[PDB]
Structure formats: structure tokens, C-alpha cells
Design a protein around this ligand. Structure first.
Ligand SMILES: CC(=O)SCCNC(=O)CCNC(=O)[C@H](O)C(C)(C)COP(=O)(O)OP(=O)(O)OC[C@H]1O[C@@H](n2cnc3c(N)ncnc32)[C@H](O)[C@@H]1OP(=O)(O)O
Ligand SMILES: CC(=O)SCCNC(=O)CCNC(=O)[C@H](O)C(C)(C)COP(=O)(O)OP(=O)(O)OC[C@H]1O[C@@H](n2cnc3c(N)ncnc32)[C@H](O)[C@@H]1OP(=O)(O)O
Ligand SMILES: *C(=O)CCCC[C@@H]1SC[C@@H]2NC(=O)N[C@@H]21
Ligand SMILES: *C(=O)CCCC[C@@H]1SC[C@@H]2NC(=O)N[C@@H]21
Lengths: 210, 541, 56, 541
């Protein structure tokens, strides 16, 4: 079965993500007119205070919160649950592969860093660990009223009918087109408020359910 | 930074639903018919005139254009259907002229070629109209003009419709004199026989090329000096290449044959000292996430059946990414920011009738785009302007005039695409032909009238019942049938896409796949001119 | 237009008249209360000056 | 060419001398105290209000700023000490608002966040002052403004000091209307409850984001309509996100929660069509040759003991290279050309009192820098203007007015740093707060008054002895002690760095190491506006 990641492995995943964001910043700068300028160094240097970034990584099924403090000397202090790790490192290339060079509490290591959509892959000589980046809700999310003052074409339902969602309820022709009223609702039509052929008015009720 | 993820538009349609299959079959039929009609237009005046044209050693005009532009480069041809069934028994293919935006020596140019296989290069009224439209494209977008003159002069029994008015033949030379006063280069290659109105085209151009023993320039030809002064002259020594290149000085470069003229033209364009400078921001281009025959399945051919315009924007923009603006207020207008080939586009699309809130949403959006210098793309699918009483009480015609006033005053490049109907003053709110868009293409299912027919027949009948009610008698079923026949027939005839592009009311009927490419081509040509600051009028609040 | 004058009980402004809303939406309205001078000068705000008759 | 070698400034100090060790201990104490005070300011209104703020599902405002700017990007926060011990028993941390220059979507922006944990987002007078200072930074440097509105309206018992004047609350909306008329983008994210003066902040902005079931905009809230019209309404249906996003049309984008609002804000900034273009020359940046805790050892905390300003310039500029200008004429002013992060800087630093020759040297230098479009950095350490008789005979006040007139008329970016005292009209000669520098930081050892304590007490005593000498009696030791107590106490209290940045008289107390970084950040922000030609007045020769 899959085993839980060690806190040191979560530090490596967090560091790889931070350095990948830096890489994106660096390749933006290489295309800029304002070259050599500050703001391009992803140092997190606040004035008179320190910056702590709170990120969450998903280890299998469970979420872990990692508080990453940006230090003045370029190191990171990553507190995972309670334990603080001194995390340093950088990226380097060998041919077409990107490697993440780490030092966590004086312990040096090297792993291949591959980030594909949401999943952080760390390939080392002791195993392979997959850490997922959570996806926020706003990137994963994707009775009736008469629209215009028009004449009624056809009434589909009666007093006492049971319909479904996405079902043709009434049809009206307005000026040049054809707009069918369809039901988002659930329940029973007790009321057909407009007789066939009448002129409905915008923002108006056609069918009522109890 | 530009690394953080976003969402995209569009959903995959039901490929098995009968709505999709019927829509696909109808729009495929329209597109196949469009293809076979333009392949017949591609021949020109028939194989007899083509044989007599190549028997004198000339190229055909599309061969001239293929040898003039860069190798492998695309060619955006404008108004391929001008003159289509327009004159009663005369066939004028392509208008009798070929206009297009091409790429010569790494510069995007406007190319105007006299197709001499049709009527000997005579100038019909639609020929003058199509040429003047090409010239105002080149003056708006600051593109050099290359005229490949092989003319025949102005037709005689249509001479009124060609000669005196403001936008008649003489405007052509006006447009050469003004463009060259703005440093927009004119180049004329004389490959034919310029007779007395065509003779002003190379003489008003900065640089000429004339072909040895083939091109002739004279203000009065041999039958014209016969009828005017009474004189017999031979044509090649009245106005041939040797006299003009050596004695009179009308021509500047001298070519052996047509290949030499086109090679010299590419040299002349390279010595123009032109460098294209962009002022918008550019990003890496990216293809969408959906195909474009899905647009055949989604749009169909039924204009009484509505669809969603977000499906179209999902299939023409970069990566199908779209930042929607005011998505819940006035939701019969879809406004937002996208990218086409790396260019920033503000898109305005119709999704229903125009209420008051939709027009206010559009006015806010057009002011935003003009403040930031972002080009506009209008996607017209209109049916009306919300007729009613509680609507006129609010100020609906107080609110559509703000939309009209903002679209008129806007100084960014605007491009219209008519993907559906386009009726009434709604057509003016969404940048119709009168509002100077840079380009205006249509899809083969479009309709454009002042109404839809039924409405015109009903208004005329009720107005004449009111009018006759000073005395008052009815002819009920007779009046009904006899007004519902010739008005529905007329409006459906004149609302056709081929009727409207037989005139020069638009820049082309395009295939719904090709849409994305065509927009990109048009947008890059429209970026040759620097975008100027917009001043608006008085917004009536 | 920047400034309007509309005449009392004579001038009417509407984007769709009575036979036009008849043929388009199917509605009967009277013209002087669909788009007359009183509605535009007092409620909708299309008109800026209000005249009694043509000399005014 | 740029290959030929040059010399550099600076010498390594005696790390063992008692002067260095005492200076290091004093400036280390000042910097540690500055750090602990700003860490207490970082919490805001205490842990009770933070718990009730996150119990409603909101972020804390510094979390909002961290999630809005680019990841890892620095943040230049302005006026962290506004409101510090300013009101008598009320604690207003940070002013009640958080302003700073950050980097959003690769664009450097000004961010103004209502810190709603302190006084429910009420607007104290220092809150209005600090916000207006941020807005004039953004109008001078042409930076887009992002307002993160979580307001509470204008405080009541201080209402005079907030409401009517020119630089009172209403100026805020003036600055939004003028900046947006110059194409400087305004973006408002409504995360709170905008009550009747805050309600004009999103309605004056080009693009809005409002959060579902959390952000509310109304010109009159529920107790306000109670006291004004007598009406009970619920707040989330009086002015919630659904009404404004769907019916009234005040809002343009609709967010689910705060993370969605910040993600949408980064999208909106990316669609601004902005590209930063530089007009100065840039060279490869290089770090200096000396550390920056040496500045603790060199400056110290004794303002009666002078030092050399060339030691500071040696530790803030590129490679410690410095081209000195007129090094032997008027040597109490050090002028020259250096580079900070590759940007060309003309530096003017004080080394003593201002004579006449020093002011003429400075006027020549400022004309040189404005002719070449080089930004200016003033390093104030002033004690006076050389009082004397043989000095007024020459025209000392004829020569300091030339310095004042040249610094006032200069149209390049000017940045001041007060590293020591700053007294009298000398403060005006070296670009004080009245002379519109872009930024003005201070070090924790600075002092600023009109004439320092002793001098004011002596002048008041001698002028009251002269004044009373119309009759004339003395109270010698009594008058001496009783005027030397409350005047030295007052001047030393009001000359403090925390006194001056408790108001918005400067943009921050900075640590002498951080100096180099802060200058670089400020200078790059100051290069977003194109440098205009300078016109001078009349130099009185
Ligand atoms: C006077 C004016 O400015 S208005 C007309 C211009 N003046 C003229 O010279 C009119 C006479 N035509 C000419 O200009 C020339 O002699 C040309 C271009 C027609 C000579 O062309 P050619 O290569 O010899 O071909 P041809 O003369 O047979 O013309 C082909 C056809 O086009 C017609 N045509 C050509 N030019 C014109 C014209 N300007 N007006 C009317 N019809 C024309 C001809 O009637 C001929 O008729 P067809 O198509 O029914 O057979
Ligand atoms: C003068 C004008 O421009 S009209 C101002 C209209 N006044 C208001 O709308 C403010 C009153 N209402 C609120 O503050 C709303 O509840 C919110 C959403 C803005 C704040 O949420 P809450 O935290 O529930 O408000 P709460 O009642 O806790 O206010 C916290 C403190 O802010 C104070 N406060 C808020 N606005 C003001 C104001 N304009 N003047 C004086 N005090 C204020 C409250 O009295 C309260 O007292 P405290 O200073 O002892 O803490
Ligand atoms: C077909 O287009 C339906 C009827 C047209 C609507 C009419 S035509 C003139 C009025 N102007 C407008 O925008 N709508 C009205
Ligand atoms: C402390 O700053 C010493 C005395 C101040 C010098 C006085 S104050 C007003 C005069 N102006 C000036 O530049 N110096 C004089």
C-alpha cells in the first residue's frame, strides 16, 4: 500500500514548488525591458518584518499545512505541524532533466523534480513520492419567469402534472425568434397562470408549484 | 508572472443528438455550396478568354498574385462575390478585379489586380465600389497599395453609375493623392492597356513598372482620337513602353515580361524603408481546446432557434480562455477579454434581444477598451431592440443611443462578424457597415434586413388599414395573401448572404472553421496603424 | 442630439411603434402614452426642453 | 567600451576602536527596538478581533496582500507607523490601513487594504492622510491602484478632522476620477461592508470584484436609513452581492470567497494591456564592496558627532564606484554620479553646514541632472545654513534660494533619505517633504525640527528680555531653568522619528542595511513614468 510522506519529503515538495515559481518569474524577466531590476528576485523581503507563506500540500488523502518563512539569507524555515526545518536548495539541469538540490537541517540530498498539472514527482535513490497540490474551488466548479413581452405559443403542462429538470414548459415567440421556457425546478405544476395565446410580460411568473 | 492557472470556456456537444446532426448537415451543405460557387468564380471569364490572354504572353491575374507575394504566404482575398448575379444577363466574376491583403517582401500590402479576362478589364459600377473599398482599407490600416493595372476603361451604357458622383471612379485618384501625401506607398505595374481613366492610375503612383511591348498608357487611345480629333495612330507607338520609359518619363522601371515586372515590384517594396512597430502587448499564441466543425454542429442554419455565443468564443480564442465582464447583468450581451494569436481582443457578442441593461453594459465595456487600446470584435446575432411600453418608459432609446455613440466614436480597430441575423437599429449598436469597422465578414447562414419580413408585411398592412379607415373597407384574405406573398419573398431574397456580398456591403462570406485564421490575419493587418486617443461625444445620462 | 425640444401632445419618440409592437411582440398601445412628450420629459428623460406648440 | 578600470570609494573601519563599538551598540539598540515595535504593529487589533474576523470566513489583510502579489516577490510597505501614539487612549495600528507597492501579474501596483481588525475599518484622520499619500504616489509614478475595501465609514467624534477640508476624505474620490482620466487603472475588491463613504470607492473604480454573501455596498446602511428615513432593512438584501451583480449593476465580477476575489484580481491586472518602457540607460547591477552593518558602526546615534557621507555612498551604490563632482569647491556638499541596481543616480549628500559655495555647487549639479534626465537622491544630514555677518554680506540667502528654486523646479524622480538631523531652511534646500520627493525615508537616529531645542529656547529668552526691556526686570535663574525645561523637552519629543512618522511626514523608518534594497525598489517604481523636460524659474545671479 501507499505510505505517508515524511516531513522532510514535504519540505522538498514545497521547496520545488517555490523554486518552480521563481523559474517562471525569471523567464518573465528575461523577456522584460526592465532587466536587472529588483522585484525580480523572489526573496520575499518585507520591510522590517518577515514573510511567512502558508501553503497546503495533500499527502495521499490528508492535507498538511506548511508555514514557510522567507529568511534574509535565502534560506527557508518550514514549520510542518510543529517541527521547523531549515530548508535550502536550488534547481539545476542535466541535459533535458531538472533536478532539485536540497539541504534540510544539514542533510544534503538530490531528487529529480517533475511537476505535472497538480502532482509533484520526486524521484530519488530511496523511492518515488507523489505529492498533490490542492485545487481551489473556483477552478473546479465548472419558479420560472417570462423573458420578454411576447405572445405565448404552446403550453406543455397542466394543473397537476409532474415534470423533470430541463423539460419544455412553455414556448413564446418574441419579435424575431423562439424562446422556450424550460424547467429547472422540481415538483408538481398546480398552476398554469397564462392561457394559450396570451401576452406574457418580462420577469413574470408562468408556472407555480406548491 | 503569468504562471497561475485559470479556467476555460466551452463544453463538448452531444455528437449523437438529432439537433447536432441536423445542424451539421445543414451547415455542411451551405459550406459545400459556398466552395463550389467560389471555385466557379476562380476561373474568370471562361476558357476562351483565358486562352486568348495567355496567347499574348501574359499571366493570369491569380498567377500574378501568386508570383508577387512571398512564397507559401497566405493571401486574404476580399469580396470574392462582388457582382454575383447583380447585373441582369452579364456575368462579372469577382467584380472584374481582385483585391486582397498579402505579404510582399515581408511587408503586408494591399494588392489590387485588374482581372482582364472579364469584359476586357472594363469597369462596372461594382468594380469601382470594390476598388474604393480596398483603398479605404489601405488608408485606414496604412498598407502600401500595389495596383496591377490591366484595365479597359469605364463601361459605356452604365456610364452614369460609374462617372460623376462622389464615390465614383474619380475618387480612385483622390485616394491615391491623399495616401501618397501620408507616406503610404503606391506602386503600379502596367501589364495591360490603360485607356484614359486607367491612364491616371500609373501616373498618380510614386513608382511605375511597365512591361516591354505589352503595357500601354494613353489619355486618348486610337479609336478615341479617331472619334475626338480624327486621327489614326498605332497603339504601341502612341503609348508603348519605349516612349514612356525613354522620352515622356511616365514610367520609372522597365520590364521585359511579367515575371520581370513582379521581381522588380518585390525590389521596389523592399526599398520602402518600412518597419512595423507594435504598440499592443503580445503573448505566446496558443490554439483553442475545441475543433471548428463543432461550430457547424452548434450554429446550424435555423435563425429562429437560438444558441449560445460562448460556444463560438470557445472555439476561436487562444486556449479557450476568456475573462468575462459583468456576466450576470444584462446577460443577452456577452462582453469580455480574450486573445487571438497573442493579440488582446475585447469581444462583444449577442445572445438575445437588446434590453437597456445590455446596452449600458456594452457602453461601459467599449469605454474600457478604448481607454486601454484594446481592439474590438463584435459578433452580431441580433433580432431586435425590445419593443414594448414599459421599455420605452425607462429609456430604451436613451440607452441604445449610448451604445451607438460609443461604438461610433471609438478609435481602436473594430472587426465585425455576422454569425446570425442582423436587423434594425440593433445592427447599428453592434458596429454595422456604416460605423467603419476595419473588416466585416459574414457566415453563410446570416440574414440582414431592416426587419424580418413578417414584421414589414404586418406593419404595412396595419398602416394601410389605418390609412384607408378615413373611408374604410376591407379585402381581408385577399389583402393578407397578396401582401404576405411579395414581401416575404422580397425580404428573404434581399436578406441573403450572396445578395449582400454581391454588392460590397461586406468583406466576404467565410467558412466557420476558417474564422479563426481570418480574424488573426485581419487583426495583424489592422495593427499597422498606431492607435489614436478616443474622444467621446456627450453621453446622455 | 445634445439638446432636445419636443412638443406637447404632438411629438412622439419610440424605438417600436404601435403596429411595430403589434407585429413584433403582439401588443396594443396608444401612441401618445407610449412615447408622448409627458413620458419623455418627466420620466424617461429623453427630452430636455418641453414646448407647447411649434412657435414655442 | 566600458572595459577600462576605475577606482572606488570607502575604507574599512577600525572594528576595535571604542568609537565604532559604542556606535554599533547604540544603532543596534535602535534597530532592535524598531523591529519589536513593528512586530507588535503587525498583529493589528489584537487576537480577539482577529478571531472574530476569521470566524466570518475572511482572511486577515496581510494574508490578502500575500495572496494577491506575485509569489516570492518583495513588498514595499509604506508608513507602518502611522497613528503610533497619536490619539490619546486609542490605539490605531498601522493607521488602520495598509499601503504598499507590490508586484501583481508582473506589473508594479499600489495596494491599499482596509485593515478591518482595528476599529471595524473606521477612518481616522491619519487613515485619510495615509491613503491620500498612497494615491499621490500612484498618480506621480503612474501605478495602478488596487483597493481592498473592508471599510467602516468615517469616525464620528473626529468628523471635523475627517470631513470638509481640501485634503479630507472627499479628495479620495477626486483622486480616483483624475487617475482614471489619465489611464491609470483603478481596481476595487469589495471584501467588507462599505457604508456611505466607502460605497463611493467601488463605484468610482473601473472594475469591481465583490464577494458572495460577504461584501456590501450601500449609500445608507440599516441604522443610517433608520435615523434618516426611518426604515428597517436587512443588510445582505439591501446591498449584497446578488443585487449589485445582477440588478443594479454596480459590480462587474462576482467572487465566491476571498481566494476567488484575489485570483480574479490577478486576471484583471493581466488584462490591462500595460507594458513598462524605460528611458534611462541600464547597466549590469553589481553589489558594493563593503557590508551594511558597518553603517551601524559609522553612523551611531550621536548627532553632535559628525561623520563622512562618503562612507554611506560606499555602501549603497553599485561596486562602490562614484564619480565625484567638484570635490574641492564647497566640500560640505558631496555631489556625484553613481549607480543603484543599474540605474543612474545623481547623489547629493550633506557633510556639514551649508555655505554659499556649497549651494552654488548644488545648483549646478541639479541643472546637470535635469538636463541629462538622471534621478536624484538627497542624503540629508543638516545642522544649519551658516549664520553670520560676513555670510549675509555675500548673499548666503541669495544662494540658498537658488538651491531651493532648482530643487523645486526639477522634473526628474527625487528621493530623500534623512540619515541625521534636518533643521531649518536647510531642510528645504535638500528636498524636504514640501518639495514633492517621490519617497522620503528616515533612519532611526534622525531628528527634524525648525531649529533644535537650545536655539529656540535661547531666541525666545533673548527676545522676551528685549521685549520686556520697555520696562525691564529680570528673573535670571528662574527664567533660565523654567524656559530650558519645557522647550528642550518639547523639541526633543517632537523631533523623534516616531513622532514624525506617526503623522505621514515621511514614508517610513528604515533599517540602515535595508537602505540599499529600499532605494532600488523605490527607484524602479519611480521609473514607470516618463521623465518630462524641466523648466526653471529665474535664477537670481
Ligand atoms: C471613353 C472612355 O473613357 S469610356 C471607355 C474607355 N474607352 C475606350 O477606349 C473604350 C473602348 N475599349 C477600350 O478601351 C479598349 O479598346 C479595349 C480594352 C476594349 C481593348 O480590349 P481588347 O483586348 O481589344 O478586347 P476587346 O476590345 O474586344 O474588348 C472585349 C469586350 O469588352 C468590351 N469592352 C472593353 N472595354 C470596354 C469599355 N471601355 N466600355 C465598354 N465595353 C468595353 C468590348 O465591347 C468587348 O465586347 P465583348 O465582351 O461583348 O466581346
Ligand atoms: C459617518 C458616515 O460616513 S456614516 C457611517 C455609518 N456607520 C456604520 O456603518 C458603522 C457601523 N456598522 C459597522 O461598522 C458594521 O457592523 C461593519 C460591518 C462595518 C463592522 O462590523 P462589526 O465588527 O460588527 O461592527 P462593530 O459594531 O463590531 O464595530 C466595531 C467598532 O467600530 C466602531 N465603528 C464602526 N464604524 C464607525 C463610525 N463610522 N464611527 C465611529 N465608530 C465606528 C463601532 O462603534 C465599534 O466600536 P469599537 O470602536 O469600540 O470597537
Ligand atoms: C426583426 O429584426 C424584428 C423586428 C425589428 C425590431 C424593430 S425594427 C425598428 C426598431 N428598432 C429596433 O432596434 N427594433 C425595432
Ligand atoms: C539647528 O538646526 C541649528 C540652528 C538653525 C539655523 C537657523 S534656523 C533659521 C535659519 N535658516 C537657516 O538655514 N539657518 C538658520
Amino acid at each position: 500500500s501507499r505510505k505517508a510522506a515524511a516531513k522532510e519529503s514535504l519540505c522538498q515538495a514545497a521547496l520545488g514548488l517555490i523554486l518552480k515559481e521563481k523559474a517562471m518569474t525569471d523567464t518573465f524577466t528575461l523577456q522584460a525591458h526592465d532587466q536587472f531590476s529588483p522585484f525580480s528576485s523572489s526573496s520575499g523581503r518585507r520591510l522590517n518584518i518577515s514573510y511567512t507563506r502558508n501553503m497546503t500540500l495533500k499527502d495521499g488523502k490528508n492535507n498538511v499545512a506548511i508555514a514557510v518563512t522567507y529568511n534574509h539569507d535565502g534560506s527557508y524555515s518550514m514549520q510542518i505541524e510543529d517541527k521547523t526545518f531549515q530548508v535550502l536548495g536550488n534547481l539545476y539541469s542535466e541535459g533535458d532533466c531538472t533536478y532539485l538540490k536540497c539541504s534540510v537541517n544539514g542533510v544534503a540530498s538530490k531528487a529529480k523534480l517533475i511537476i505535472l498539472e497538480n502532482t509533484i514527482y520526486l524521484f530519488s535513490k530511496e523511492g518515488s513520492i507523489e505529492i498533490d497540490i490542492p485545487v481551489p474551488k473556483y477552478l473546479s466548479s465548472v419558479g420560472p419567469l417570462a423573458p420578454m413581452t411576447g405572445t405565448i405559443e404552446k403550453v406543455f403542462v397542466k394543473a397537476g402534472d409532474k415534470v423533470k429538470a430541463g423539460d419544455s414548459l412553455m414556448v413564446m415567440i418574441a419579435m424575431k425568434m423562439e424562446h422556450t421556457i424550460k424547467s429547472p425546478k422540481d415538483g408538481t405544476v398546480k398552476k398554469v397562470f397564462y392561457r394559450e395565446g396570451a401576452q406574457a410580460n418580462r420577469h413574470t411568473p408562468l408556472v407555480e408549484f406548491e | 508572472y503569468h504562471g497561475d492557472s485559470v479556467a476555460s470556456l466551452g463544453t463538448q456537444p452531444d455528437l449523437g443528438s438529432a439537433l447536432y446532426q441536423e445542424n451539421y448537415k445543414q451547415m455542411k451543405a451551405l459550406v459545400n455550396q459556398l466552395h463550389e460557387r467560389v471555385e466557379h468564380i476562380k476561373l474568370g471569364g471562361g476558357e476562351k478568354a483565358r486562352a486568348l490572354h495567355i496567347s499574348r504572353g501574359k499571366l493570369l491575374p491569380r498567377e500574378r498574385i501568386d508570383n508577387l507575394i512571398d512564397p507559401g504566404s497566405p493571401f486574404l482575398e476580399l469580396s470574392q462575390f462582388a457582382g454575383y448575379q447583380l447585373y441582369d444577363n452579364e456575368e462579372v466574376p469577382g467584380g472584374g478585379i481582385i483585391t486582397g491583403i498579402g505579404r510582399v517582401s515581408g511587408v503586408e500590402c494591399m494588392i489590387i489586380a485588374n482581372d482582364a479576362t472579364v469584359k476586357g478589364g472594363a469597369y462596372y459600377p461594382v468594380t469601382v465600389k470594390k476598388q474604393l473599398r480596398a483603398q479605404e482599407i489601405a488608408m485606414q490600416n496604412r498598407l502600401p497599395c500595389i495596383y496591377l493595372v490591366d484595365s479597359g476603361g469605364a463601361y459605356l451604357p452604365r456610364q452614369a453609375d460609374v462617372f460623376p458622383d462622389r464615390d465614383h471612379f474619380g475618387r480612385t485618384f483622390y485616394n491615391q493623392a491623399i495616401m501618397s501625401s501620408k507616406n503610404i506607398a503606391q506602386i503600379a505595374v502596367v501589364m495591360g492597356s490603360c485607356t484614359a481613366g486607367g491612364a491616371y492610375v500609373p501616373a498618380m503612383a510614386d513608382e511605375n513598372i511597365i512591361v516591354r511591348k505589352q503595357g500601354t498608357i494613353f489619355l486618348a487611345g486610337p479609336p478615341l482620337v479617331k472619334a475626338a480629333t480624327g486621327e489614326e495612330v498605332s497603339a504601341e507607338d502612341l503609348g508603348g513602353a519605349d516612349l514612356h520609359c525613354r522620352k515622356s518619363g511616365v514610367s520609372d522601371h522597365w520590364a521585359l515580361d511579367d515575371h520581370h515586372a513582379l521581381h522588380l515590384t518585390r525590389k521596389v517594396v523592399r526599398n520602402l524603408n518600412y518597419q512595423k512597430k507594435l504598440d499592443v502587448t503580445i503573448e505566446p499564441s496558443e490554439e483553442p481546446l475545441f475543433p471548428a466543425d463543432e461550430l457547424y454542429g452548434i450554429v446550424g442554419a435555423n435563425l429562429k432557434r437560438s444558441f449560445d455565443v460562448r460556444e463560438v468564443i470557445a472555439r476561436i480564442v487562444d486556449g479557450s480562455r476568456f475573462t468575462e465582464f459583468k456576466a450576470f447583468y444584462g446577460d443577452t450581451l456577452v462582453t469580455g477579454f480574450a486573445r487571438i494569436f497573442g493579440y488582446p481582443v475585447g469581444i462583444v457578442g449577442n445572445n438575445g434581444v437588446l434590453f437597456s441593461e445590455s446596452a449600458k453594459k456594452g457602453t461601459h465595456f467599449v469605454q474600457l477598451c478604448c481607454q486601454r487600446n484594446i481592439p474590438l470584435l463584435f459578433l452580431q446575432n441580433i433580432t431586435g431592440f425590445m419593443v414594448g411600453r414599459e421599455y420605452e418608459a425607462e429609456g430604451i432609446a436613451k440607452d441604445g443611443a449610448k451604445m451607438v455613440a460609443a461604438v461610433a466614436c471609438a478609435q481602436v480597430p473594430k472587426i465585425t462578424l455576422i454569425i446570425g441575423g442582423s436587423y434594425g437599429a440593433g445592427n447599428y449598436g453592434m458596429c454595422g457597415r456604416a460605423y467603419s469597422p476595419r473588416f466585416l465578414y459574414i457566415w453563410p447562414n446570416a440574414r440582414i434586413s431592416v426587419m424580418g419580413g413578417e414584421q414589414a408585411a404586418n406593419v404595412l398592412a396595419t398602416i394601410t388599414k389605418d390609412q384607408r379607415a378615413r373611408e374604410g373597407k376591407q379585402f381581408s384574405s385577399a389583402d393578407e395573401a397578396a401582401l404576405k406573398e411579395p414581401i416575404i419573398k422580397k425580404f428573404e431574397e434581399e436578406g441573403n448572404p450572396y445578395y449582400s456580398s454581391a454588392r460590397v456591403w461586406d468583406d466576404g462570406i467565410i467558412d466557420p472553421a476558417d474564422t479563426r485564421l481570418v480574424l488573426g490575419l485581419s487583426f495583424s493587418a489592422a495593427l499597422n496603424a498606431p492607435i489614436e486617443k478616443t474622444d467621446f461625444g456627450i453621453f446622455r445620462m
